[PDB]
Design a protein around this ligand. Structure first.
Ligand SMILES: NC(=O)c1ccc[n+]([C@@H]2O[C@H](COP(=O)([O-])OP(=O)(O)OC[C@H]3O[C@@H](n4cnc5c(N)ncnc54)[C@H](OP(=O)(O)O)[C@@H]3O)[C@@H](O)[C@H]2O)c1
Ligand SMILES: NC(=O)c1ccc[n+]([C@@H]2O[C@H](COP(=O)([O-])OP(=O)(O)OC[C@H]3O[C@@H](n4cnc5c(N)ncnc54)[C@H](OP(=O)(O)O)[C@@H]3O)[C@@H](O)[C@H]2O)c1
Ligand SMILES: N[C@H](CC(=O)C(F)(F)P(=O)(O)O)C(=O)O
Ligand SMILES: N[C@H](CC(=O)C(F)(F)P(=O)(O)O)C(=O)O
Ligand code: NA
Lengths: 358, 357
């Protein structure tokens, strides 16, 4: 069996990585929980076992077969290359390595083939991108994809445990203490590292991550760039608006596409229904559509409100929902590791292709 | 001055209509509040004065100059034609008369001209449509509009006072009682008149109003058909997705447009800033963009996140936010009434064109 390390075991994704590992088929002989100096020394469960949390260091990866990283881009940049050098296969939840040509960017239902040529690091894509890829890939396979316009409705757990706690505090202050939403104090949202912070309670913040040079945010551009890499087609036009709403878990997305060929809606429905990891929830006669609260806890991606555009021949609208901590993060990572095992790809990489930052 | 009646004075919109009238320049000699039998007798304030709520009947409109309706489509269906008969000018905040060719469907900043030929009824458009029209008209004036794609983030107050209280209860039960959002009991949302009801707490419900036979909701279809009427151009392609989110007040909209001619972004920002009723809130270097919680209480429509599409040369994305009970309803209605007064259009209609029921 494998020695498996979870880096960032204490965070929101880390907690779900633990759960998905507990429920995994992976033969695990030994598990290790790694975090920062803040959590080192504390204890955390794996099933019934007590696991002591260790500080993540350059030397902490000896004897490790598989390491799942979810501790921010900084941690992966510093330590993932040292893990590869130790002989680990890293599944990385951060954006740091995603656009590196030596790094597969994988949703297993879409591009498992990319895993075969890995060089020690597999990047888990952006959470909002992942669920959109599951929904759209069965459509692309049959009718092609020319463009995507997406507006997201994103849960706060994607910004981490602190953002979850901030959201609950703000809501409790409003609903129990009578504080006005605009009088709330915020410390993290919309973006922890950015200069200014705004309340999320009873609000909708059209900012996820920091702004880039082109007035789109990094989140919006990640949706653009990662889609093109995952689907291996730079010609797919993608533009996004990414918005944080008062939901703790599960991202929802209003997705518009134009296919290359006319895609009859009933066949699109059937195509999505038949695609692994995708579930059709589309019965408007009984008000059946994907809902964030129903998707929580499920590894599946739910698709409904499917209908053609009122004017554009090749245009289709839909509503896509998935648990952002599961398919958006921890489940996608564990599924990658299971696929690596299936394909006999869990082994050291001889040639190091990644800078050691010390 | 005028005698002004508010029909549906006790509701969420009714309360804001009172507030907008209290803050209005309209010369009001006498104020009347109308509602159902359940409210008849009770008292509501107009500034410092005590006004007794009257039951709305087909004969209760004698002497009235202006009637603002926001009491449901069936209430306007039954009573507005009798108000017109009595010589009233009706400003209707329901969807009922909106597609009638004899009825102007008005956003004052956009199509005030349409008021001149009114036949006693002027329809206030759908809330989510209004703020989109305020944002987009200044762009259409200069570079035209080929298509609109819009995804909404709608506040629960649009569904009425009960939807607010249902949302608050649900959130309290999750946060205070540890009830999973899954297990919440709902009675109103997504749509009061529909068969099944779902929790909104920590959720996003892709249903507003009921479904039509083309799989779009009436809300999505209203944004389509009302846009075409307001902008007087049936050639504008409009497709919408309308979503309820856990916000009490103010609608947000992710709006994609394609113009007829390429519209330079700084000029688009300048045109929106210069347009009455629209405010530019767009300074990404300082994280400035419209926000629902900031828009509550204001008559203005706030526009930001303005940027060209990454690929379509004439494509532009933006973010539009307005208080759905103000510009979305009560303020648009009162502003209509003020515009009628300015244009000398508050007078009895000679020819009745609406069937008495
Ligand atoms: N409510 C509770 O009683 C409870 C439950 C769960 C989590 N928590 C705590 O709340 C914190 C919230 O985290 P967050 O909002 O900042 O984001 P987060 O995404 O939820 O977690 C970030 C993860 O990255 C790890 N990390 C950060 N810097 C690191 C470094 N230099 N080297 C190795 N790992 C590093 C963190 O470990 P560290 O934990 O050591 O910082 C954490 O596991 C967690 O870190 C956790 O300690 C509390
Ligand atoms: N706790 C709650 O669930 C909640 C809270 C406040 C009010 N309500 C009542 O529930 C009903 C619908 O719920 P909602 O929250 O969506 O209300 P709403 O939209 O905020 O208000 C609807 C308004 O229309 C009026 N109206 C209804 N039927 C009428 C009729 N046949 N003739 C004249 N006026 C009429 C109501 O007056 P009336 O008040 O006289 O009915 C009310 O002022 C309303 O009638 C409202 O009064 C419910
Ligand atoms: N902030 C996250 C998305 C991110 O920006 C991220 F976590 F860095 P990713 O690795 O791209 O999923 C969110 O709102 O869900
Ligand atoms: N349900 C309302 C919109 C409506 O359906 C309406 F109140 F009937 P309208 O008069 O068309 O604004 C909302 O979501 O805000
Ligand atoms: Na194998």
């Amino acid at each position: 069996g494998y020695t498996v390390a979870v880096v960032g075991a204490t965070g929101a994704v880390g907690a779900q990585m633990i759960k998905m590992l507990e429920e995994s088929t992976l033969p695990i002989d030994k598990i290790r929980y790694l975090a920062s100096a803040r959590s080192a020394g504390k204890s955390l469960k794996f099933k019934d076992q007590d696991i002591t949390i260790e500080e993540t260091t350059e030397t902490a990866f000896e004897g490790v077969d598989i390491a799942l990283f979810s501790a921010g881009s900084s941690t992966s940049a510093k330590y993932a290359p040292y893990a590869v050098k130790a002989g680990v296969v890293v599944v990385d939840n951060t954006s740091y390595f995603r656009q590196n040509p030596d790094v597969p960017l994988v949703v297993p239902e879409v591009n498992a083939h990319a895993l075969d040529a890995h060089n020690g690091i597999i990047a888990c894509p952006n959470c909002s991108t992942i669920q959109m890829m599951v929904a759209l890939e069965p459509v692309r396979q049959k009718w092609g994809l020319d463009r995507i316009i997406v507006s997201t409705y994103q849960a706060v757990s994607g910004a981490g445990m602190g953002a979850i706690l901030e959201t609950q505090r703000e809501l409790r202050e409003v609903l129990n203490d009578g504080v006005k939403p605009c009088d709330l104090h915020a410390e993290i949202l919309p973006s922890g590292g950015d200069k200014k912070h705004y309340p999320i309670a009873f609000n909708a913040l059209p900012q996820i991550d920091v702004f880039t040079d082109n007035d789109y945010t990094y989140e919006e551009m990640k949706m653009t760039k990662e889609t093109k890499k995952i689907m291996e087609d730079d010609s797919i036009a993608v533009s996004a608006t990414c918005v944080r709403i008062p939901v703790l878990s599960a991202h929802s997305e209003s997705v518009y596409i134009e296919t290359k060929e006319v895609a009859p809606i009933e066949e699109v429905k059937a195509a999505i229904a038949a695609f692994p990891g995708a579930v059709l929830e589309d019965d408007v006669a009984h008000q059946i559509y994907p809902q964030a609260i129903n998707a929580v806890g499920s590894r599946d991606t739910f698709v409904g409100r499917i209908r053609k555009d009122l004017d554009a021949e090749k245009g289709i609208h839909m509503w896509v929902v998935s648990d952002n901590l599961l398919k958006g993060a921890a489940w996608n990572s564990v599924q990658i590791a299971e696929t690596l095992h299936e394909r006999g790809l869990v082994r050291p990489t001889a040639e190091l292709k990644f800078e050691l930052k010390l």
